[PDB]
């Protein structure tokens, strides 16, 4: 048995197919079992149609053995492209080993595993090419995440499945040369989605475009929402944000990720370049959902 064949066979029982079918459509995806009580993690874009139109879509989970079981949507987070499903009263479940994405290094060999019984499912192999790489993702909203970049091929055949290290541990969730959501970030989102059915992210009310020159490189403020924390913090248009809190901002993509790293209700510093002068501002991030939270 090969080195990668052993690893792929080890986690095959913990990867499932996710089928969402209507009267005229259908779409498949991959998921991973992360809890013995029947909790399955995929990415939010696999089950987007069933979430926005639940009166016409049925979501089932197909196992490695061939068992087909109905599933229930616990919650989803479009801003991190994550979602949690639930299957009821299924015993002898093979739960996946969840690793620590903070221990992943550049050059580590990985497997991008899709569901074994998927239609066009794949299993690709590569290494970790970059860590903490902001990447944008296209009725769901557009988002930007820090991703574990890998030269293993991510496609519709292994999207939603796990990114696996050589210990058969899940270090990421494959998404959309290929990118995966870190498992440490996935644990935070999934733990909140199981508990409350929702996730609350900070907001500032800013639109930014990218800029890169000798004066200042970063995220240039393109808009300020009325009554937003940035409006009450003194942020103006044409400002060039270079630091959000404790993280330097290289472009609009890193800016979106840096805002999510902030704490809701706590004062945070913002460093901008206004008409050639470096100005330090202070904002209090609002929750994107005030009723949840």
């Amino acid at each position: 048995a090969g080195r990668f064949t052993k690893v792929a066979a080890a986690v095959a029982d913990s990867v499932v197919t996710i089928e969402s079918v209507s009267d005229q459509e259908g779409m498949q995806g991959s998921g991973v079992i992360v809890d013995g009580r029947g909790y399955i993690v995929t990415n939010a874009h696999v089950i987007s149609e069933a979430a926005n139109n639940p009166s016409q879509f049925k979501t089932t989970v197909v196992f490695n053995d061939g068992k087909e079981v109905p599933a229930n949507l616990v919650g989803r987070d479009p801003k991190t492209d994550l979602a949690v499903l639930k299957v009821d009263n299924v015993d002898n479940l093979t739960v996946a080993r969840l690793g620590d994405s903070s221990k992943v290094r550049v050059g580590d060999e990985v497997l991008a595993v899709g569901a074994p019984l998927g239609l066009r499912s794949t299993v690709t192999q590569g290494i970790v090419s970059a860590l903490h790489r902001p990447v944008p993702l296209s009725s769901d909203t557009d988002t930007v995440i820090d991703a574990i970049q890998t030269d293993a091929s991510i496609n519709h055949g292994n999207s939603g499945g796990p990114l696996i290290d050589m210990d058969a541990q899940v270090i990421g969730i494959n998404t959309a040369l290929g990118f995966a959501i870190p498992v440490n970030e996935m644990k935070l989102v999934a733990n909140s989605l199981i508990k409350d059915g929702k996730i609350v992210h900070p907001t500032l009310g800013i639109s930014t475009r990218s800029v890169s020159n000798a004066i200042a490189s970063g995220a240039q403020v393109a808009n300020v929402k009325a009554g937003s924390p940035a409006q009450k913090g003194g942020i103006l248009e044409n400002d060039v944000i270079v630091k959000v809190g404790n993280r330097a901002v290289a472009d609009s993509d890193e800016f979106v990720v840096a805002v999510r790293q902030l704490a809701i209700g706590q004062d945070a510093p913002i460093e901008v370049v206004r008409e050639g002068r470096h100005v330090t501002l202070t904002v209090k991030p609002d929750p994107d959902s005030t009723l949840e939270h």
Copy 2:
């Protein structure tokens, strides 16, 4: 010497360049020596122009040592994209180790080897991503095969060459993220092409389009040829074929492959969904070439 360098050097002498040149055109490809009597296996699309227009095309085989030798087309099978060439009176030939594609597992490391002296020839490396994956291939006819999907790059530089395991054994023929024809299927086609110069595949006289919903997912009958076995079997238009013989049919691609698995002249069951009712039919497949057969 590296692990892959050792394997690539082991099979280099059994991979050849295939040159087809005319008064105004030329195209190169790769082949593999599978028999000491001078039998070379490539895919049918490398030598398509020389087969359809033999009065103007010359087909030569270039070896690893640099020897250029004229070749003769034994036979071809467009429906599996396979062809067999013949070189006469060449001694001390390095015949390739033919493996067993039924022993190949997902995750096995592979090499996609092209001819060493090819112009734009390549040698790519990857793993097996999927097994028994139906895949469509574009004056030759379009076909669909079960393929050994691999994340090793298949291109014009290694097409027609062998897919190689870590024992330097041929497990597939590279074709056209990359796909290869299984060696077990290649042995069946090549053994018949050497014996009779032809291959006879079953036919039903059906055109199908794909369909995927909650009622029924499979291959929807788009046409029925007059006097075809499907016409004498009771298959109608708008039927949704879900099982051809002993193989479930997920789409039109798997349907085309499932028909080739049938036996000519033997009754076979067909399961369709007609106006919401599951109906089991019986057909007797005809030979596509009645004079050969």
Copy 3:
């Protein structure tokens, strides 16, 4: 620690980011430290804008530790896509191990390393797919090089960085399924660029287009410059060059590379096919820069 993680960590200190910024633009690239006196090698297309417009572009080098240091353009060679930078008075530099590209074999595992602190920098892994492969490269002029073809991904994230063997030795410079400039060729160009600030390549004054048929395959003369060595050597239009000196010419790409292998001022044979007759001609290559040379 993984096998590739160990190699990537070994050379990380010898790979640098190269930043060229103006009042309205900016572009990043990768380089490699090849000499303790502060000599950095990248490819010519990373610093093209700063070379052609030095009055408006500033070129800085960012190190692994985060140090940003101004850089000076020693010289560039568009015909091989190579350039040498210089940093002054920087001690404790980690100089990269330079290997021997003539000892590289097909199948050898390689790493394509980009600068660690680059914005969209990558580290991809693959094998060597082909050696001595002519490949064309797009106000700089178009060129063709022999390259170490690899199935590791080369992109804007690791372009200009080193191609690394399993001994953490530089065997190539990543450029532009992926290609790299051999380290042996890089040493020749860099040694001349450091010494004289320039590189002198042979010229013939010929334009060629590709041709591949049964009569003759090679580079067909499309133009002859007035007073060129080819004009004084008897080369005519519609000639089909098949051998430049001691190297056979398969197309226009190999022809461009074969000319650079010639010696300036020394008689060299040219074999053409003129109206069906093989004719052997003799040319004396001129220097492309007569004042340097």
